[PDB]
Amino acid sequence: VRPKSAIDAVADAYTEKLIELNPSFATTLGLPGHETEYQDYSPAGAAAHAEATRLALEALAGLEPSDDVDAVTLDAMRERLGLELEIHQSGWDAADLNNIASPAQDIRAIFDLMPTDTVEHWEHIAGRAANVPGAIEGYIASLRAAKDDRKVAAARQIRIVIEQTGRYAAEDGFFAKMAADASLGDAPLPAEVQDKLDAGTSAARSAYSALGAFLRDELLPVAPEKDAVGRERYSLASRSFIGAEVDLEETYAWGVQELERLISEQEKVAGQIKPGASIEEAKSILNNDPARQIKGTDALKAWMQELSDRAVSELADVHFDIPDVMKTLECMIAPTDEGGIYYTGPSDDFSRPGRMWWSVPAGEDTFTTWSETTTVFHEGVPGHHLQVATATYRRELLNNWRRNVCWVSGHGEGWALYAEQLMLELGYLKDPGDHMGMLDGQRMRAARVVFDIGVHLELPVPERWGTGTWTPEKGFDFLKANLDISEGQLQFEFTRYLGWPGQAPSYKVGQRLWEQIRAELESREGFDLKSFHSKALNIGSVGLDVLRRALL
Ligand SMILES: [Mg+2]
Ligand SMILES: [Mg+2]
Question: What is the 3-state secondary structure (H, E, C) of 467-535?
């Protein structure tokens, strides 16, 4: 029963404008009306977004907060929107292209959300396919304008997007298969809608082939070879992922030291698995021990479930406030192989509980759990589930901007890392195998800090990892030493960090900042850890600067 304020009204109106400007955002919100439409990716599209943003800030400028909730809203919006305008004004937004989260991927990805149960559904898919050309044309218009302004993505990233988009457009690629395999009730589409689908998918194929040609012929020849984006671009991207403007040299130095600590810890844990064992030697023992393997998905679900239910029942009303509807975290098998464990939060009304989904790679039916205990806490309780479910629980106290728009990577990923560290400190990882798995994920995330900042700023390589200053080649060998992952995933992560600067440290740096907030509050009389967790999580997703000011 907290009534909406004038500030919430501005926040809600801005949200409606965002929905109006980006119809893809409405479909990803479940809002009907604009199922076939894309945002305007052209420069005029970007100017319109920026203008709406500038007008929203102006509207907020003379509005005093009516309560603490308003003050957080003002702070979060001023931070997020102000940063958005700094990035737009920098000119680099127009050049946006990378291997993972840029318009070429986004324009294709939206199709995966669309239902396929009625003729009208298939008309929507066909109609969206038929709008892929205009989306791509506007995107090419922004890339071309940035190019004329001497701002072009690294050659590596352009080459990757030419590869990815050529598969989308190929004879047997995404859009072709969409039209060829379409069904309704396990039967072919009626001919009239099928023809709409064939025409639309055909246009989508041609548009992705044109982006390919443009990239190849106009952009690639002027693309820089150098991947590093440099200090000025880096600091703005870093802010986008963390919501704090960190000291980059200081953060880099912290990350190098933190990686060294985590390796030292792994060496200690190795000796707890087998006296005097190297990390690699201990890992063969864990990975070859019949006791650390589970057979079949039923037993796997049972294992996840017990861990989750135990964490809830032990932490409830001790370290966290967990309302009854949040105590359920259903552990499940992913219908598809999303390549790891993922979390889906509860419905707004809590009729669907939070769920955790383990993706089983094709043909796999035995499961090693030592490395995934920590992941259960990260993706589940007290990580993502408590954070996401608490924000959702407090939704009546949160305007639509806060609920549906404002989201900061360092905040939510930092929290899941905080959560793993808390479970270490509370004695959940005493088994050396489980401990090792936690350290592995921390080590990989500490390596991200060193790589991202070191490479993009061309900093001195730490003597443990090389000499001179960082180059992408040196960075690749460094990742290979610190990430226990497949060859193909290593190559992907490498490419990602190079093309998406600022995001990779958001995990460990988010953890650091969360821990700094808690450490400060701990210095004071009456600190109460449960009360801290409640106040913080109630706020929802905000930048780390904003969170610190809401809490200190
Ligand atoms: Mg040192
Ligand atoms: Mg996650």
Answer: CCECCHHHHHHHHHHHCCCCHHHHHHHHHHHHHCCCCCCHHHHHHHHHHHHHHHHHCCCCCCHHHHHHH
Distance 134 CA to ligand 2 centre (A): 33
Residue holding tokens 């989201």?
Answer: 407
Where do we find the tokens 């991927």? Answer: 105
The residues, any chain, with a CB within 8 Å of residue 55's CB and separated by 6 or more, are none
Query: What's the one-letter identity of residue 497?
Result: Y
Experimental method: X-ray
384 has binding-site annotation? yes
**263 Cα–ligand 1 center, Å:** 13
- Output the CA 113–ligand 2 centroid distance in Å: 19
Structural domain that includes position 119: 1-552
> Comparing C-alpha atoms, which of 422, 303, 306 is closest to residue 368?
303
Tokens standing for 145?
Answer: 């304008």
3-state secondary structure of 51: helix
**Nearest ligand, CA 380:** 2
Q: Helices 248-273 and 506-522 sit at what angle, rounded to 10 degrees?
A: 90
Strand partners, 357: 332, 342
172 C-alpha to center of ligand 1: Å? 53
Q: Six-digit token pair at 173?
A: 């690629």
Three-state DSSP class for 99? coil
**What radius of gyration do the chain's Cα atoms show?**
24
Query: Does 533 carry a binding-site annotation?
Result: no
Measure Cα distances from 204 to 165, 175, 231, 262 in Å: 11, 7, 37, 48
Resolution of the structure in the document, Å: 1.9
| CB-based contacts of 157, cutoff 8 Å, min separation 6 | 97, 98, 99, 495, 498, 499
Comparing CA positions, the residue from 251, 228, 273 lying closest to residue 435 is 273
Q: Please give the distance of CA 325 from its chain centroid, rounded to a whole number.
A: 26
- The CA distances from residue 492 to 67, 101, 371, 477, 497, in Å, are 46, 13, 21, 14, 9
DSSP conformation class of 216 = I
**Interacting residues of 101 by C-beta distance below 8 A, sequence separation 6+:** 500
Distance 435 CA to ligand 1 centre (A): 24
Strand partners, 294: 367
Number of domains in the chain: 1
